[PDB]
């Protein structure tokens, strides 16, 4: 059975909607499944906010070390790193790190506030040639993931192209590109997702995301041992608001599309 048949069967049994885009950077060939369809990004949008600050840092050498005050009122829901710093400060670099590696919601909101609101993240993405991405809200409401709601969504192909440009391509100057890559590789939340569908020795940098409607996402850059990198985005969402998140489906999808490398 083709790779297309297998994803279709995986999607059907799962009872949800699956979106996959794999780019093989060796020859720019692509494996696509519902890749032009919009999905709620949830926490995968944090990469774009962190990337926007890195871009700023290319022309402002003091920026990443700028300190930001964390107060009890800044805290939203789920703040594993920021709660450790109430009444203190975190630099913009520390916020970038926490947001990506721990998916800290307070850190995300701080970064968006620094940039001037969700619309500035959207403008940064456009500046990269990404015409799909839109961020509309802050944490935690950007995670509602209501079916058919276009707010805070992108498509798997658009997000694959953009993640490729950010980590392996021309989006960021080298020092900032390397920082983004260091952050993604140190991610702590993605063991059960894309990483679980791959050979154990491959190196992966990824950002997970989860939200309502059992929306379960992961976007990853993958460095095989003896091949050029792959970029892989897997988005998955379900029709009932209180559906369980399904990291195992992303892992199942990663295993299907990388069988052959
Ligand atoms: B992200 O990984 O999609 C996250 C979203 C939420 C978290 C905690 C609480 C509410 C939403 S992490």
Curated annotation (Swiss-Prot):
Enzyme class: hydrolase
Swiss-Prot/TrEMBL catalytic activity: a beta-lactam + H2O = a substituted beta-amino acid
Membrane-spanning residues: none
The keyword Signal is annotated on this UniProt entry: yes
Any GO BP annotation: beta-lactam antibiotic catabolic process
Active site: 43
Record-listed E.C. numbers: 3.5.2.6
Binding residues for substrate: 207-209
InterPro entries the record matches: Beta-lactam/transpept-like, Beta-lactam_cat, Beta-lactam_class-A, Beta-lactam_class-A_AS
UniProt-recorded Gene Ontology molecular function terms: beta-lactamase activity
KW Hydrolase (keyword) present: yes
NCBIfam families assigned: bla_class_A, blaCTX-M
UniProt similarity note: Belongs to the class-A beta-lactamase family.
Quaternary structure, from the entry: Monomer.
Leftover remarks: The class A beta-lactamase family has a specific amino-acid numbering system, sometimes called Ambler or ABL numbering and often misspelt as Amber. A multiple sequence alignment was used to derive a consensus sequence and then the consensus was numbered taking into account insertions and deletions. This allows use of identical numbers, e.g. for active site residues, despite differences in protein length. UniProt always uses natural numbering of residues, hence there appear to be differences in numbering between this entry and some papers.
Functional note: Has strong cefotaxime-hydrolyzing activity.
PANTHER family hit by this protein: BETA-LACTAMASE, BETA-LACTAMASE-TYPE TRANSPEPTIDASE FOLD CONTAINING PROTEIN
Name of the molecule in the record: Beta-lactamase Toho-1
Gene name as annotated: bla
């Amino acid at each position: 059975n083709s790779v297309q048949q297998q994803l279709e069967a995986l999607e059907k049994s799962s009872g949800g909607r699956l979106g996959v885009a794999l780019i093989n950077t060796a020859d720019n060939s692509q494996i696509l499944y519902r890749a032009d369809e919009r999905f709620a990004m949830c926490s995968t949008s944090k990469v774009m906010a962190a990337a926007a600050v890195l871009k700023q840092s290319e022309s402002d050498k003091h920026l990443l070390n700028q300190r930001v005050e964390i107060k009890k009122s800044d805290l939203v829901n789920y703040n594993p790193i920021a709660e450790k710093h109430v009444n203190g400060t975190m630099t913009l670099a520390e916020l970038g790190a926490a947001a990506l590696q721990y998916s800290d919601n307070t850190a995300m909101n701080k970064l968006i506030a620094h940039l001037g609101g969700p619309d500035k993240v959207t403008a940064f993405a456009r500046s990269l040639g990404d015409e799909t991405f839109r961020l509309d809200r802050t944490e935690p409401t950007l995670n509602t993931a209501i079916p058919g709601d276009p707010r805070d969504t992108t498509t798997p192909l658009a997000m694959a192209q953009t993640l490729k440009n950010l980590t392996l391509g021309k989006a960021l100057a080298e020092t900032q590109r390397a920082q983004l890559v260091t952050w993604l590789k140190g991610n702590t939340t993605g063991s059960a997702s894309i990483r679980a569908g791959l050979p154990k020795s491959w190196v992966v940098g990824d950002k997970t995301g989860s939200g309502d409607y059992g929306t379960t996402n992961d976007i990853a850059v993958i460095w095989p041992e003896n091949h050029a990198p792959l970029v892989l985005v897997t988005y998955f969402t379900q029709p009932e608001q209180k559906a369980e998140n399904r990291n195992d489906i992303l892992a199942a999808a990663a295993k299907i599309v990388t069988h052959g490398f």
